Design a protein around this nucleic acid. Structure first.
Ligand SMILES: [Mg+2]
Ligand SMILES: [Mg+2]
Ligand SMILES: [Mg+2]
Ligand SMILES: [Mg+2]
Ligand SMILES: [Mg+2]
Ligand SMILES: [Mg+2]
Ligand SMILES: [Mg+2]
Ligand SMILES: [Mg+2]
Ligand SMILES: [Mg+2]
Ligand SMILES: [Mg+2]
Ligand SMILES: [Mg+2]
Ligand SMILES: [Mg+2]
Ligand SMILES: [Mg+2]
Ligand SMILES: [Mg+2]
Ligand SMILES: [Mg+2]
Ligand SMILES: [Mg+2]
Ligand SMILES: [Zn+2]
Lengths: 108, 152, 115
RNA sequence: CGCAAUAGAUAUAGUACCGCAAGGGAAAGACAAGCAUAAUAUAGCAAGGACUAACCCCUAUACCUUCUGCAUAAUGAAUUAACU
RNA sequence: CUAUGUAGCAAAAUAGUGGGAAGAUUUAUAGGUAGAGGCGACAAACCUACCGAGCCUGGUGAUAGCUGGUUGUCCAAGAUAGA
RNA sequence: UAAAAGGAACUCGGCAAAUCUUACCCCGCCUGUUUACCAAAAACAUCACCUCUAGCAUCACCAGUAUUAGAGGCACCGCCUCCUUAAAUAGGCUCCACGAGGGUUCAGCUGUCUCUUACUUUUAACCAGUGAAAUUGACCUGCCCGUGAGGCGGGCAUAACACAGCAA
RNA sequence: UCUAGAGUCCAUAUCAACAAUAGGGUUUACUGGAUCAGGACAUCCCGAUGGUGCAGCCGCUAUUAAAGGUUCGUUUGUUCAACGAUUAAAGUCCUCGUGAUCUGAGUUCAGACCGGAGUAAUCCAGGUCGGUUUCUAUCUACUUUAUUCCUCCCUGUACGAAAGGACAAGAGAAAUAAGGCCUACUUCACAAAGCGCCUUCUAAAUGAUAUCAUCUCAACUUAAUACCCACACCCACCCAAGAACAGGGUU
């Protein structure tokens, strides 16, 4: 059907500003104790995750530049090595994806 | 009523559900780490685990080969499954994938999730460590370790 | 489930029935408060343009465990006063008629086979 | 003892736009209502008598027009501003 | 014929089920018939979404014993024979 | 989409769905046409038949001439001017063929039903973006009985506030 | 209400004529069905009691009783009626009760045919076939308050004039209603369901006004538990909990 009467600003305020409709204050924010950026407990530090995705993208660009075209999933493991890092004794027989910047401190 | 139904409903029906999960799983086997909506990744985690289980049986088995043929779409990955992934987990008997939640998607504010196969070459996800063992509460609990061990 | 408007094949040698007729016997009423009829529930049949009392002796509807589940809704014609009209029965009748009270003693003295 | 941007020409224009067509035909330029600051507390034409006191107490059947009077019997009005 | 839709995707559509489908069929293109007129395998059917009589301008501020309205303050007289 | 037993007991009617068979009756001969947007029909048209008018030039009928043209009625052709059901208010001029026409019946079929149930998709509910419309005197918008009804009277009830439903 | 008339005798076991006292309508001539139902009792059944001409179950009337129930079909739709099978019963009415819940017929929409009236157009409180009413819920209100039947003992005692044939008390079996479950069957398959399963609690005694008597608008004496139930958390995950919020678990 249709309304029988306009609804006043008072009723509309008792509806719109009722607590159930308010935005709740979040009790689960904190500071990355080492890195020092904001984060929720159960979620990754956004800044750290972005700085990881950047390096993943650069590595993957090198991988694409080396594999040539599509349909070339290798049949061996892969290892990524930064400048001035000779292939360790454990990484022989694994594809090497050379990169041209110093290894990040967070890359172990 | 939906008591005891473990399978999400997604896509345009059951078949599209299998096909969506198949594309997610193929992306995972190809890149070893993918960011996807949280619920879809949680649905695909079981399939990725059982795919590694089937891949351990090895090429020679035919049932496993048919299964990996269905569940991998670019077939270059089937070698990998049977020669890089399944060999990699010859020790672990379970839990080959780690799944995290990440900042919600910018456009549609969906609940996201990064899922990866343990042990890959990629830069490591920023996992959350526990509190250092030297914190006050941990030190008191360490004192209790000692004092209880001596008594017993 | 022998309810109203269900075809039942008379198996009693049917001095009356068993003769050709373009209709087939139908149940028009079940002598139970609810419509559904199970073994031993005596019903009413429209057979050969006539109304005759009946007695169900087997049905395709699964019953309890240890009782037979036939594949045809079998019925024996019985006269109003309980006497069976026929003199024989060939199709097997379940041994679950010696149970719960009813006019069943005569219908077992006239059959020949059980299960 | 003519108007001064809802007036004065329809006019910044017979343009925009509507129509197949004849044809129709605009708008405008220089702390009103609505909200926020500040959601609400038994009870009721939302007021009045009041009271130390906002509510609580007592009183109290909305307005216009049409029918003999009309509890709202029916018609009309969301509300502000301008024109009527 | 049914279901959806009823400010809808649409001012008559969608999905299925259906009738015709070498004919009195269907159809693109230009022309013709003009309003008491045209056309009509007559249904008052159709003539640019609304046809028992198109649409636009003019006479036109049509007329309306009918409906609705009719704007400052205050006071005072003020009602139900009939032809 | 699937369904136990039963298979029209649903219902105005086997509408819908599943399955594919049969028989008749009324109307209309047939194919066709019609109320763009509630009626596709038993109405219109139609071959066949009949009636009426008309002896004839260059713009229609017609570059036609009574076996022709126009206007009407009718509708080829031939023949004349008690059963059914358990139960029944239903069905039962000749004239092949045809009908999304109307009525009835056999057999089958099926969630129509006895009597509902599960799953899937859209809708849905929540989060994020964009964001209408009818409606609206004011509302601080209760129940029962009476008067003539949320609002009057007499009783009863009564802390405020979202959200999703329902339709008195 | 007078019984007055009857009834093999007799008003009261039944009709009970006229009338009177009561509650209720009569409009044409010169609105059903589905769904859910709320309510009254003027009770159809079940329950309790009186009399009987029922010598007895049942019948008949009368009082009381509204917690519960009150079937399925063929033909047809001024809505009823008839008919078949049942049932313990297939009650009488108010709120079409209920169309912003759904449907059909109508009666009154344009098409057409038949019959009547008319010179015609057209009419007809006639008969047939066909035929479109849309709604996003603002406000109120609301959304967790065990009966019946059959069978059998007890048996054919009492009652009874022969004949027929009781209570009180138990025991089985079925259905329905409410509530719940998924071991089996069934549709299906980490579960939801039913066609399946389980539970359901006005006759006396004493006795006065009126010393006998009298049941007493005389005094006086007799014929539901169950269920729920911890003040202070809530980021995350799971869930037999769930629309969101809530709720259970994380040893
Ligand atoms: Mg979806
Ligand atoms: Mg101007
Ligand atoms: Mg102007
Ligand atoms: Mg202001
Ligand atoms: Mg009112
Ligand atoms: Mg109004
Ligand atoms: Mg005027
Ligand atoms: Mg006048
Ligand atoms: Mg005066
Ligand atoms: Mg079935
Ligand atoms: Mg045709
Ligand atoms: Mg036809
Ligand atoms: Mg939103
Ligand atoms: Mg009232
Ligand atoms: Mg609400
Ligand atoms: Mg099921
Ligand atoms: Zn960090």
């Amino acid at each position: 059907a249709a309304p029988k009467n306009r609804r006043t600003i008072e009723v509309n305020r008792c509806r719109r500003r009722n607590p159930q409709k308010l935005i709740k204050v979040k009790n689960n924010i904190d500071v990355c104790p080492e890195c020092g950026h904001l984060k929720q407990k159960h979620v990754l530090c956004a800044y750290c995750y972005e700085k990881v995705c950047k390096e993943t993208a650069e590595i993957r660009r090198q991988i694409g530049k080396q594999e040539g075209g599509p349909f070339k999933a290798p049949t061996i493991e892969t290892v990524v090595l930064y400048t001035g890092e000779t292939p360790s004794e454990q990484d022989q027989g694994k594809r090497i994806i050379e990169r041209d910047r110093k290894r990040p401190s967070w890359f172990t | 009523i939906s008591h005891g139904r473990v399978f999400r409903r997604m896509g345009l029906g059951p078949e599209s559900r299998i096909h969506l999960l198949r594309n997610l799983l193929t992306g995972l086997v190809r890149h070893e780490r993918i960011e996807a909506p949280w619920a879809r990744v949680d649905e695909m985690r079981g399939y990725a685990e059982k795919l590694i289980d089937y891949g351990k049986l090895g090429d020679t088995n035919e049932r496993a080969m048919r299964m990996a043929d269905f569940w991998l779409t670019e077939k270059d990955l089937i070698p990998k499954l049977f020669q890089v992934l399944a060999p990699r987990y010859k020790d672990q008997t379970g839990g080959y994938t780690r799944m995290l939640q990440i900042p919600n998607r910018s456009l549609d504010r969906a609940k996201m999730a990064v899922i990866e196969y343990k042990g890959n070459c990629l830069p490591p996800l920023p996992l959350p460590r526990r509190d250092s063992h030297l914190t006050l509460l941990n030190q008191l609990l360490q004192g209790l370790r000692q004092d209880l061990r001596q008594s017993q | 489930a022998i309810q109203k408007m269900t075809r039942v094949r008379v198996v009693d040698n049917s001095a009356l029935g068993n003769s050709p007729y373009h209709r087939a016997p139908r149940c028009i009423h079940v002598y139970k408060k609810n419509g559904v009829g199970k073994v031993g529930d005596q019903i009413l049949l429209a057979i050969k343009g006539q109304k005759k009392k009946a007695l169900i002796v087997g049905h395709c509807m699964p019953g309890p465990r240890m009782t037979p589940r036939f594949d045809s809704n079998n019925v024996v014609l019985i006269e109003d006063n309980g006497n069976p009209v026929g003199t024989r029965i060939k199709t097997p009748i379940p041994t679950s008629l010696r149970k719960r009270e009813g006019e069943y003693s005569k219908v077992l003295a006239i059959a020949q086979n059980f299960v």
